[PDB]
DNA sequence: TACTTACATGACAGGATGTATATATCTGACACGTGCCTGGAGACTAGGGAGTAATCCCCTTGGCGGTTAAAACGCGGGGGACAGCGCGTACGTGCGTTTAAGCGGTGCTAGAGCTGTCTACGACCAATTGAGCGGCCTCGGCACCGGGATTCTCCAGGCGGCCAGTG
DNA sequence: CACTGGCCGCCTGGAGAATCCCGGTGCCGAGGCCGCTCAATTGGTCGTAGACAGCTCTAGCACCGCTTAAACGCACGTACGCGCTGTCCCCCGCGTTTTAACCGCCAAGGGGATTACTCCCTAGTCTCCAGGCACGTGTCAGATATATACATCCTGTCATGTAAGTA
């Protein structure tokens, strides 16, 4: 069980903080240091970026919906 | 007194023709004169590879449980082996339509 | 009547009885056969053209066909052709 | 609700049946029909044999199917499962033509 | 008399069939025209040959030994009609 | 003492000269062309035995040659080697 | 008391002799008989190939300023026409290297 | 600092350098002692002449730069510039080698 | 006089000069062992035929000749070496 | 923050259907019997190509002494390959309609194709020759070298626009 | 919310090395001439191959009628390529270092090639005869038909993970 993997998602996100957004390859292997089965939650990671997109707690740099690379809101 | 006529098929041992290979060679034109074994040498090559060729082509129609043989079984006797495939890789089969061969990406999961 | 039109399905059909007594074949087979030895033999006799021709040679000899067969024949293949091919000149040159 | 199959597999269930069959894929009358009009573009009232329609036949529709072996390799090579021309025409150029 | 598009005989479908022939699985709507005309291309070569031979041999009906001879010199020698 | 070894010198040479009477050759694209005329000579030679062959005529005519260059030759090459060939076989029987 | 010799080619006003392809054909085993016009004709079709050749090379030359020419002459004049890479498709030429030929992609921008 | 041209330029200069030049690219030496260890394994004592080769070293040139052309179009088919070892696989495959 | 890794031989430079003639801007790593390999399956074939086409000679030295007909027979005809 | 809850996404199960799986039948193509004659060989002969010894000489093979070009290696790094993923998207698939191919059915004649002629033509030997190739030189077109111009290719300052920060 | 500074992306101007590009120098391979020789030519004959002429007889041309799958076009689910934004890492490029390839030179002999001799071998031809070709004809393997099992596969309902609300 644990915490929701959004959670980690966030922390991950937050951890690098590049000029530029973070695409999705250094993002998957934020979550294999972490820890989690990146393989078998391809669907899982997919819907959590479609919410915490569509929420409006993160905002999307260049990309279009969950293409692209993201990086942290304003405030 | 003239001898009795053998055949140089059955001289070589050979089922096929050594007299029409010859002739062949004779009349098709191929250098001004023909060494005499080069027709059974040859002969002896076209018997070993019809042969073995319906060695697959019987094998395989026994593996379809029918016991003539269609051009699907000639096709499914060369394309089933590698080293006819080299040698018969620009040639079609009337009717003999394609080996199966399915590549495997395009197969399902 | 009609002229006699040449083929080899007799000899088809006999190493066919040969290697497999119990099976049949089809006509379309049988000239599928026909052309797979119409065009192995035309090969064969390219090869042993240009062979003859490269060495000057005003004939086709044993060891002509045979280079032709290493150079047509694929692999061993070839060596069983080659080994067919030299059991049946010698039993041939022992009359 | 009447029943219905997924995109492919019917696809696939025909690769397998006509890779199975032997038969002529085309039919045989419009095939004779468009010979006869290449042929008329060439020389005036030409016949055919039967046979010579048969061999035509099988060798117009093997040719089309080594064009097609040489088509999924690219296609493959291309990573995709939707064929395009330019992956024809590739086969073509590196066929030799 | 004269006819001017029978290229359209050889159907979708048909080409469709013989895709699925080669294994295909999907196949977009710009490769049938395309096919159809390399196939114009292809007998083009071979009829050429055909008629070459045909006018060469003085007949005025193609044989099917015609059609094995021409596909012969291009490469894609054809069994089941030598003869 | 050394045999003589026959090529295609002077005549690639004289069709040069009249083609280009200011431009030379080098030794090397000369074999190029010696190369070149031998293998067309051999697809035409080649193509109308084959043809010989078909036919079941025992001689090569100059219909022949004319059919073989439709064949290997295409289109406006071929045709103007036909034209050439007919100018050529009238003022040889002419002469 | 007999004729002055007079060759076939000057008869048909050709410089490629005619003598000498007649009789390498006999002697190059293609048939039994040849027709005169034959190798007439073959000398023809052979003489516009190398006049065609030796002005597309002499062109080449022109085009690189050097009076001589080089199998990259050559190689030039083959593949900047169409229907000889039709006839020599699969024909190698010493020392002609490749025609320039840089793919639109490979360009920067 | 010392000039320095980007990543491919130097490469396209050589591209139209060598497409510019005719000369062997391949070593002689070295292809002469593959030719004869080559030739070793198949039959003993094989002696080659210089013009031999020569020819195979033109030879091996032109059917490498043939099929590097090849592997290339296999390549831009595949929306890449660096080749890899499946193009050439591709070109063996399609070509029937 | 025996000889061991002449794979070598053809070296990554000669390998890359090949394919800066061979149109090829970037190279792969992977590309110049299986290369080699392919150059040498490519030799294997052509030595084979022209080494049979001497030994049909009776010949011991190697001749372009029979090199240059090795590789017409496989439908790689050269031009240049008395061919 | 753990505990509880309810829905998206797979887990598990099940029935329709197309293709494989069980015989029944009748058919004609395939297997088999018959006349033959066209073709397979046997023996002698003519004669011709090719196998083999010698040798020689020339072209290849074996060997050495430098030489940097070339091969090899290492680091900086820009660039190529690409994993995935929405997003428009184009095509597979189901299914009634249509029509034109398929089946099956008749006249025939024009054309494929076999047969007698005799001519057109080609193949081939002796003599003769004259064009075409080996040898050699010689020389200027080309192989090699030295110095500006331009072209290419990276670099750098300026402007604007965008982006971020604060009152 | 409006002002404002700062930094990068492109515009714009600069700078220096690689190769044109232009002039200068020797040298080698082109080709022109000489010698040779052998192959092309011609006349004439022998022989024979194929177009011509004529016939004949068979399968495609031509036409005609019934039928149901070909196909075809629309609907609609639904699988698809692909640009793209990075990220990963990987050869490209620019050096330095090292070494053996190239050049130049030298000695050896291997065998490629040529000539000569000789004899092994093979087409030709008449003839005799015999084995597969032509042709005819019976007949069970399968081509078709009818009833049945299972993949299969897609779909209906549960399990679980997980996101969301809450004490």
Redesign the interface.
């Known amino acids: 069980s644990g915490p929701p993997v959004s959670e980690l998602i966030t922390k991950a996100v937050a951890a690098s903080k590049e000029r530029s957004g973070v695409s999705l390859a250094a993002l998957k292997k934020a979550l294999a240091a972490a820890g989690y089965d990146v393989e078998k939650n391809n669907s899982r990671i997919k819907l959590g970026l479609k919410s915490l997109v569509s929420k409006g707690t993160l905002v999307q740099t260049k990309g279009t919906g969950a293409s692209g690379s993201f990086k942290l809101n304003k405030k | 007194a003239r001898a009795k006529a053998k055949t140089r098929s059955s001289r070589a041992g050979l089922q096929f023709p050594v007299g029409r290979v010859h002739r062949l060679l004779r009349k098709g034109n191929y250098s001004e004169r023909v060494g005499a074994g080069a027709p059974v040498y040859l002969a002896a090559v076209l018997e070993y590879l019809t042969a073995e060729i319906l060695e697959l082509a019987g094998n395989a129609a026994r593996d379809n449980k029918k016991t003539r043989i269609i051009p699907r079984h000639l096709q499914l006797a060369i394309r089933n082996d590698e080293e006819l495939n080299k040698l018969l890789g620009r040639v079609t089969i009337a009717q003999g339509g394609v080996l199966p061969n399915i590549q495997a990406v395009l197969l399902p999961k | 009547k009609r002229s006699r039109?040449?083929?080899?399905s007799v000899?088809?059909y006999?190493?066919?009885k040969?290697?497999?007594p119990?099976?049949?074949?089809?006509s379309?087979?049988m000239?599928?056969?026909?052309?797979?030895?119409?065009?192995?033999?035309?090969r064969?006799?390219?090869?042993?053209?240009?062979?003859?021709?490269?060495?000057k040679?005003?004939?086709?000899?044993?060891?002509?066909?045979?280079?032709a067969?290493?150079?047509?024949?694929?692999?061993?293949?070839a060596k069983?052709?080659v080994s067919?091919?030299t059991?049946?000149?010698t039993?041939?040159?022992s009359? | 609700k009447p029943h219905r199959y997924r995109p492919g597999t019917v696809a696939l269930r025909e690769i397998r049946r006509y890779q199975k069959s032997t038969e002529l894929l085309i039919r045989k009358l419009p095939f004779q029909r468009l010979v006869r009009e290449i042929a008329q573009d060439f020389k005036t009232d030409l016949r055919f044999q039967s046979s010579a329609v048969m061999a035509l036949q099988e060798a117009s529709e093997a040719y089309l199917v080594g064009l097609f072996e040489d088509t999924n390799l690219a296609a493959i090579h291309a990573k995709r499962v939707t064929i395009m021309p330019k992956d024809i025409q590739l086969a073509r150029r590196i066929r030799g033509e | 008399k004269v006819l001017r598009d029978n290229i359209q005989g050889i159907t979708k479908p048909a080409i469709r069939r013989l895709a699925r022939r080669g294994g295909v699985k999907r196949i977009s709507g710009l490769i049938y025209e395309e096919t159809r005309g390399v196939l114009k291309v292809f007998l083009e070569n071979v009829i050429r040959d055909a008629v070459t031979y045909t006018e060469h041999a003085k007949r005025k009906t193609v044989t099917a030994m015609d059609v094995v001879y021409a596909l012969k010199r291009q490469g894609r020698t054809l069994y089941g009609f030598g003869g």
């Open positions: 039109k040449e083929s080899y000899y088809v006999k190493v066919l040969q290697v497999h119990d099976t049949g074949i089809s379309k087979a000239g599928i056969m026909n052309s797979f030895v119409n065009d192995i033999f035309e064969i006799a390219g090869e042993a053209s240009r062979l003859a021709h490269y060495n040679r005003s004939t086709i000899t044993s060891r002509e066909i045979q280079t067969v290493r150079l047509l024949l694929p692999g061993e293949l069983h052709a067919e091919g059991k049946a000149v039993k041939y040159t009359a």
